[PDB]
């Protein structure tokens, strides 16, 4: 008997000698959760679920599904004590965001579950008030077209992390060498993945006795400093918000009083952004303080690293034009071209089904279903729902050429797929 | 030599491929070593069509001799008739620097023994071979804008002639594991000398799960069509590991940790869904399903375990061979 | 840093549009270099130089697709110059675009 | 200081870069393609 602090345990359903104790009169009362307050604290108490720890599981008999594992077949076993709610709840937070994670070679579900942390997106809806360092925020995040039924509980509709993109799987002029991706510069002009990167700066005034105060240094009364012109500094030594700072100009003109020494705090990395907000407070002790948030946009250049939900992190090789990107029979020119050879050895066939499901669910008009073990979405009836709109039911589609206008001898496989722009940028190092 | 080039050399150099008149004027524009003079084509009753082997003869730098065999060439094709003809158009023969026959692949354009890039380092130097790379790095890299080479999901689906037969193996695999459990649970299995009845049980049953893993592996490769785009990246040999697309189509196979199928974790039950005394063909790791059809929520856990034993060794074998080589220097 | 976008179609002070050089490999042939153009202007002149029967090699390439500089190579027969092909191939295209515009304006006035 | 723009042979000038020069990894050769990669 364990009355012990710090174990771990999980809730399962209960079986009573043949069948469940979850009966229809329960879940008709759960369904109206408002104005009946029958919310899981009357379902434990009525003896339908039960917490089971890791070492009574050594004594228990589970079933996967109440459908096939209660109907008598050739009598595998008949002494079921419990059943589980739905067997895709064994995946954690960042491993639930992968559509069809029973279709991935498991090095790639592990790979994505470490890239989900890095892919930027709107993180908390009060970044107007915050003063973080390292605040990335996209312009136009989109909830995904192909989704899991537990994104809703992971809170991934009010706060998404990427933009979809019409993606084609083609070899082309050759800038996609096995981990690379040809973008579309006349889509990047319309804000595609265009994001802001904030920044912050701590500045403790400290009186000690060499003490220092916020001020403006005249050049020929204060000691060593660069040729960082002091135009942007105000009457007291802080930059008012809305003053574009260039690379390496003074933002806080702090002077250790000595004639006086010089302790400017330069804009590092020479990003040339805009100073967006300045607050002035006291510290813990009674000394004046200031935080500064210098923001910069970052258009996706050549270099900035992208990755899907299906492993296979990639770069950005060259940015072509709508002029040059290969058009369909109907004037669609895909935003991103990924290499063919990245499929069969990285081994994600999740990427060829999400790319199929987004083509159904942008013509069926209903945001699709990619729960892990749903057993009702196989790739046969994704196909025959695609075939009821006038496409080819394997997702293929005739592109034309970009430069000549020749019909390509083979087809190309197109379809919208949710891409993430990571934080491994090419302007974090230059 | 990158994958994008080395696959597409197969498609450039069949008998099927003919370049009309304007496309020669581009694939001659992207050479560097070319002497300004257009070759005379093969066919001349329509528009005078140029075969892709004539233009690929123009890259090969001067007189170079070689004979290799493409990776599809049956060994029985070297009988009396059809010796130098070889009706699959395998058997690379480069006489006198001009490609007479044969499809190329990785086996005769990599750096191996007797290779056509190897021979062009032992006859022509190195600055004549660097041009032999930066010609093929353009004229097939920029012919491919007329072919494309996509991968739809139609390129990873078995037709129903074999897909139903590929289960007719595995429905007998799980039968012949029941046949050996109930035979050895009656003291009716003679222990092979060298090991006990335990270790000779496992070797007996890992025999019947690597034949059905391979009888569902040779009938899947042969059943793929001639237009199938996985076959263009395996026959062309540019991307090896032809076992890693036999798991797309047919059967993932066995899982292992420590070289053994999954040990009993809880108490003689590898997961809480099973009975005790389960030495069966699915309660220790073997996977009936393939990635196209999806994976059972048990078998998703077992492939999470086989992918963890091989995901660590990579983190170990960078502190092993990253240390021999900086010590042996 | 990233180049500004207007450098994909402009000639600054110091560039000529075309520089013409000969073919030192094969006689009675020539070579061009259009500055700051792309496949829009390149593929029309390649194609119209193929209808001329006294032209044996009409081709063009762009060296790198990063900056725009078309290279065009022409090989004509004897009894003809290859700077006379590349001048007549343009002046047949301007007779063409003068012929659609007089004909497509009519097909608006029938609506 | 255009008094000191003299240049006679023997001097050492430190230019930025051009094409054609050789840099180290093997030894590449600088061609200039304007972006950040």
């Amino acid at each position: 008997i364990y009355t012990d602090a710090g174990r771990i345990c999980r809730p399962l359903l209960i079986v009573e000698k043949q069948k469940l104790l979850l009966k229809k009169r329960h879940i008709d009362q759960l369904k109206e959760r408002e104005y009946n307050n029958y919310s899981w604290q009357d379902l434990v108490a009525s003896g339908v679920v039960e917490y089971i720890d890791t070492l009574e599981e050594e004594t228990v008999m589970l079933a996967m599904t109440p459908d096939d594992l209660q109907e008598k077949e050739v009598a595998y076993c008949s002494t079921y004590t419990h059943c589980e709610i739905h067997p895709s709840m064994i995946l954690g937070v960042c491993a639930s965001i992968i559509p069809f994670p029973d279709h991935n070679q498991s090095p790639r579900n592990t790979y994505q579950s470490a890239m989900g942390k890095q892919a930027m997106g709107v993180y908390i809806t009060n970044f107007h008030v915050r003063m973080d360092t390292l605040a990335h925020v996209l312009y136009y995040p989109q909830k995904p077209l192909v989704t899991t039924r537990s994104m809703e509980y992971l809170r991934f509709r009010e706060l998404p992390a990427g933009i979809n993109s019409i993606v084609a799987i083609a070899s082309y002029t050759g800038y996609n060498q096995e981990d690379s991706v040809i973008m579309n510069r006349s889509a990047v002009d319309r804000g595609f993945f265009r994001s802001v990167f904030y920044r912050s700066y701590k500045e403790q005034e400290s009186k000690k006795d060499q003490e220092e105060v916020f001020e403006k240094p005249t050049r020929e009364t204060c000691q060593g400093m660069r040729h960082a012109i002091y135009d942007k500094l105000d009457d007291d030594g802080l930059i008012a918000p809305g003053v574009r700072v260039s690379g390496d100009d003074v933002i806080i003109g702090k002077t250790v009083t000595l004639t006086k020494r010089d302790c400017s705090t330069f804009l590092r990395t020479s990003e040339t952004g805009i100073v967006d907000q300045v607050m002035v407070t006291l510290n813990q002790e009674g000394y004046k303080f200031c935080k500064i948030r210098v923001r910069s946009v970052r258009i996706p250049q050549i270099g900035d690293k992208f990755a899907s939900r299906h492993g296979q992190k990639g770069t950005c090789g060259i940015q072509y034009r709508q002029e040059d990107m290969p058009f369909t029979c109907e004037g669609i020119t895909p935003d991103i071209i990924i290499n063919p050879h990245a499929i069969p050895s990285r081994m994600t066939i999740g990427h060829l089904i999400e790319c199929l499901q987004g083509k159904v669910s942008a013509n069926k008009g209903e945001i699709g279903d990619a729960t892990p073990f749903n057993d009702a979405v196989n790739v046969q009836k994704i196909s025959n729902l695609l075939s009821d709109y006038g496409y080819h039911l394997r997702g293929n589609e005739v592109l034309y050429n970009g430069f000549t206008g020749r019909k390509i001898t083979s087809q190309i496989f197109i379809g919208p797929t949710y891409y993430q722009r990571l934080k491994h940028m090419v302007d974090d190092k230059i | 030599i990158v994958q994008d080039t080395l696959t597409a050399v197969r498609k450039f150099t069949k008998r099927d491929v003919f370049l009309e008149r304007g496309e020669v004027m581009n694939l001659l524009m992207f050479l560097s070593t070319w002497d300004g003079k257009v070759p005379q084509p093969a066919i001349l009753k329509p528009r005078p069509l140029w075969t892709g082997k004539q233009i690929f003869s123009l890259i090969i730098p001067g007189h170079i001799n070689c004979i290799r065999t493409h990776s599809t060439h049956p060994d029985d094709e070297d009988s009396g008739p059809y010796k130098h003809i070889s009706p699959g158009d395998t058997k690379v023969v480069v006489e006198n620097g001009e490609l007479i026959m044969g499809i190329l692949c990785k086996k005769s354009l990599g750096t191996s023994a007797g290779s056509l890039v190897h021979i062009s380092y032992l006859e022509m130097g190195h600055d004549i071979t660097r041009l032999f790379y930066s010609n093929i790095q353009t004229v097939i890299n920029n012919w491919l804008l007329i072919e494309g080479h996509t991968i739809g999901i139609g390129d990873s689906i078995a037709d129903s002639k074999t897909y139903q037969d590929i289960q007719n193996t595995i429905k007998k695999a799980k039968q012949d594991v029941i046949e050996v459990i109930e035979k050895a649970h009656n003291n009716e299995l003679e222990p092979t000398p060298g090991n006990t009845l335990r270790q000779t049980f496992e070797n007996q049953v890992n025999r019947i799960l690597n034949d059905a893993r391979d009888k569902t592996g040779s009938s899947a490769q042969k059943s793929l069509s001639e237009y199938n785009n996985f076959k263009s990246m395996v026959v062309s040999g540019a991307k090896g590991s032809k076992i890693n697309i036999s798991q797309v189509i047919a059967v993932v196979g066995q899982q292992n940790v420590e070289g053994k199928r999954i040990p009993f974790g809880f108490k003689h039950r590898t997961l809480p869904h099973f009975i005790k005394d389960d030495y069966g063909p699915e309660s220790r790791g073997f996977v009936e399903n393939s990635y196209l059809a999806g994976l059972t929520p048990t078998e998703f856990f077992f492939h999470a375990m086989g992918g963890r034993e091989g995901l660590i060794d990579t983190a170990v074998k960078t502190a092993e061979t990253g240390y021999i080589q900086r010590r042996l220097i | 840093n990233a180049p500004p976008a207007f450098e994909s179609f402009l000639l600054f002070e110091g560039e000529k549009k075309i520089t013409i050089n000969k073919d030192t490999k094969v006689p009675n042939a020539c070579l061009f270099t259009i500055n700051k153009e792309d496949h829009t202007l390149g593929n029309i002149i390649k194609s119209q130089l193929l209808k001329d029967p006294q032209v044996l090699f009409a081709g063009y390439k762009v060296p790198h697709p990063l900056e725009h500089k078309i290279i065009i190579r022409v090989q004509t027969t004897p009894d003809y110059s290859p700077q006379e092909a590349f001048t007549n191939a343009i002046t047949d295209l301007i007779s063409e675009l003068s012929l659609l515009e007089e004909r497509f304006r009519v097909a608006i006035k029938d609506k | 200081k255009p008094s000191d723009l003299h240049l006679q042979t023997g001097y050492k000038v430190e230019r930025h870069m051009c094409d054609g020069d050789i840099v180290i990894f093997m030894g590449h050769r600088v061609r200039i393609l304007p972006w950040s990669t």
Partner: peptide, 22 residues
């Protein structure tokens, strides 16, 4: 110090150094 990106239009013994680095 920056990224390498693929580019098949350079003769092998070449590198593209951008003008903020050269």
């Amino acid at each position: 110090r920056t990224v390498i990106t693929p580019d098949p239009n350079l003769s092998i013994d070449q590198v593209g150094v951008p003008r903020s680095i050269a």
